[PDB]
Design a protein around this ligand. Structure first.
Ligand code: NA
Ligand code: NA
Ligand code: NA
Ligand code: NA
Lengths: 327, 327
C-alpha cells in the first residue's frame, strides 16, 4: 500500500507518431479491460476455445501480407519440429548466407501454426533476410518445456549445417521469452551462440513486476491488462513454477555472454518495462544492446502495419543491425 | 475527443528497479498535481517568487555533493557569460584533453546560478570528465534568446581555444532544449560541432504533445504535470512563439548532421515521449543515438542519487560513450 493511486487520465492520439500510427490509434476504441479480465480459461477445453478465438483471422492476415509482398511461406519439419520457411523477394547481399530464426509472440499459447508467421513475414521483407519461423509446441496440449525443447532442437540442427554466427534469433513476447531462455541454456552448455538476437516486446518478466503493467493498464490496445487472460496464460506456461523463476521469466537469469541484442517497444506497451529492464540488464552485463521505443506503440504494434514509418524505420534498423553483427 | 479515457490506476513501487531507486520511490508520496496546477505566475514579481521557491535548497545540495565527492566547483565568466568550472578528482586518461559543456535542466527559468551545477557535478564525477556548466541568462529578466546567445557565446569562445571534436555538449530538460537548438544553429552556420551530445530527459517538444504528458500525468514525481506551472514556464520561454516552433521545441527542427547523441529517460518521466521521439528522429536522420530508459525513473531521476545503480550505470555508459566519440 506504499503505492500510488493515480486518478483517471485522458489520452489523445499521439500527434508525435507518424500519420499512419496516429490514424491507427485514433480509430482504435478505448481499450476495454473487462474482456481480458473475464477471459480466464480453467479447463484444457476452455483453453482450446480461448486460443482458437484469439487466433481467429491470423492465418488470413498472414497469407494476405504474404501475397501482397511476394513473401514465400512454406511449412516444413525439422527434427520433428513444425517450422515455416519465410523467404522475401529481396534478400540483402550481405545477408544472403545469413538466417533469421524467428520465435513468434503471443502469450505462450497463441499464434500456433501459420498464424505465427505474421511477424516473420514482416521481418523477412523489411529486414531483407530469410526467416525460419519455429512453430513450437505450446500448452495446454504440450506443457513447457516442450516449446523450449523445440526451439533448442531446431537450433542444434542448424548448427550441424553451418556457423551460429550467421544466425540471428528472436521474436516477440512469449517467443522472445523462449529466445532468452534458450540463449541462457546455450551459454551454460557452451554451445555456439547466434550472431545477434531480436527481442521485440519480450515477455522477459511475466510476474506482475514492471511499471508498464500498471501505468499502461488499459493503455496497451492489444494486451490491455495483465489481469485475467494474460496472467492465466503465464500461469499455464509456468506449470507450477514461481513466476520469477528464470525459466519462466528469463530477465531474472544471467544475461552475461549474450550476443548483440536489438530491442523494440513503445510508449503504450504493457511490456515496455519488461523491455527496457532487459535492455538495461544486458548493457549492465556488458552486452551490445540497442533499444528503440516508439511514441504511440503498444505491444507488437511495430509489426502490425508495414506502411507505418515506425515499422519501416524499425526494420531498416534491424537490417543494419544484422549487417553489422552477423558474419 | 478521439481520446481514450483511462480509469484510475494503482502504481506500486517498482521491484524491477534497484533497491536504492525502489526505496526512493517507495518513500515518495503520491504526486499531487494541484500544486503545479495552482503555481501559475503571471507577473514578473510572481515569477521571481515562484523561481526562488522552486530553487530553494539546490545550492546547498550542490555544495554538499561537491564536498562529499571532492568535486571542485568554481564560478567564472566567459565573454560575459556566467559559467561554473566543475572538476572531478578523477578524470579518465583519454578524457584528459576533453571537455563536457553542460547546460542545466529545469523548465527554462529554474536552476540559475550555482543551483544549476548539481547535474554537472554528477556528470563530472561519474563520467570522469571536466565539466563547464553554462549559467545562461533566463526569463523573466532575460527573455529568450538570451540563453541561446549565452550558450553560443561560450561555445564560440571554446572553439577559439581548441577542437570542437574534443567537446561534448548537453544536459537536461530546458538546457537540453538549448543544446538541440544550438547544434541546429551551428549546422546551419557550418560551424564545427561537438564530438558528442548528452540529452537527458530533453525538453525537446514543449507543446503538450507526447503520450507521456498524458500517461505519466501524476506519475512523474518531479514535473508531476504539464498543466499549470510547466505550461506557464514554456509560454514564458516561447515569448509569443508557437509552441511547435523549432526555436521553442527543437524536436520539430532538422536533426540531420547531429553528432553522436546519448539520451536518457525513464518509465515515469513526463518527458519520456520527448526523449524517445528525439531518439527516433535522430536515428531516422542518420545520427548515432543511444537510448537508455530506466524502470522507475522520472524526469531527472537519473542524476538525483549517486548511489543508485541506475545512475552509476548511466554515467558509466556516458563515460564509455565519450571515450568512443570524443577525439
Ligand atoms: Na527510441
Ligand atoms: Na531552467
Ligand atoms: Na542559468
Ligand atoms: Na533501456
Amino acid at each position: 500500500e506504499n503505492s500510488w493511486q493515480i486518478g483517471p487520465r485522458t489520452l489523445p492520439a499521439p500527434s508525435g507518431a507518424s500519420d499512419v500510427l496516429y490514424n491507427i490509434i485514433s480509430k482504435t476504441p478505448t481499450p476495454v479491460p473487462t474482456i481480458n479480465l473475464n477471459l480466464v480459461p480453467r479447463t484444457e477445453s476452455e483453453w482450446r476455445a480461448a486460443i482458437t478465438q484469439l487466433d481467429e483471422g491470423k492465418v488470413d492476415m498472414a497469407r494476405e501480407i504474404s501475397k501482397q509482398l511476394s513473401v514465400s511461406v512454406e511449412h516444413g519439419v525439422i527434427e520433428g519440429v513444425s517450422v515455416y520457411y519465410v523467404t522475401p523477394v529481396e534478400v540483402a547481399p550481405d545477408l544472403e548466407d545469413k538466417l533469421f530464426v524467428h520465435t513468434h509472440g503471443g502469450a505462450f499459447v497463441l499464434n500456433g501454426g501459420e498464424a505465427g508467421t505474421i511477424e516473420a513475414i514482416v521481418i523477412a521483407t523489411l529486414a531483407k533476410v530469410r526467416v525460419l519461423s519455429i512453430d513450437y509446441r505450446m500448452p495446454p496440449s504440450h506443457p513447457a518445456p516442450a516449446a523450449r525443447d523445440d526451439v533448442f532442437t531446431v537450433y542444434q540442427h542448424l548448427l550441424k549445417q553451418g556457423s551460429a554466427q550467421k544466425i540471428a534469433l528472436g521474436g516477440s513476447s512469449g517467443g522472445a521469452n523462449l529466445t532468452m531462455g534458450l540463449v541462457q541454456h546455450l551459454i551454460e552448455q557452451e554451445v555456439d551462440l547466434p550472431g545477434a538476437l531480436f527481442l521485440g516486446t519480450p515477455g522477459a518478466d511475466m510476474s506482475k513486476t514492471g511499471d508498464s503493467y500498471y501505468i499502461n493498464d488499459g493503455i496497451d490496445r492489444n494486451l490491455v491488462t495483465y489481469d485475467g487472460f494474460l496472467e492465466a496464460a503465464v500461469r499455464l506456461y509456468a506449470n507450477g513454477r514461481d513466476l520469477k523463476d528464470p525459466l519462466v521469466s528469463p530477465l531474472y537469469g544471467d544475461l552475461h555472454g549474450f550476443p548483440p541484442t536489438f530491442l523494440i517497444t513503445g510508449t503504450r506497451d504493457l511490456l515496455l518495462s519488461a523491455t527496457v529492464r532487459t535492455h538495461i540488464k544486458l548493457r549492465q552485463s556488458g552486452v551490445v544492446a540497442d533499444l528503440f521505443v516508439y511514441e504511440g506503440i503498444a505491444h507488437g504494434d511495430y509489426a502490425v502495419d508495414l506502411t507505418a514509418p515506425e515499422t519501416q524505420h524499425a526494420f531498416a534498423e534491424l537490417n543494419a543491425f544484422l549487417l553489422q553483427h552477423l558474419r
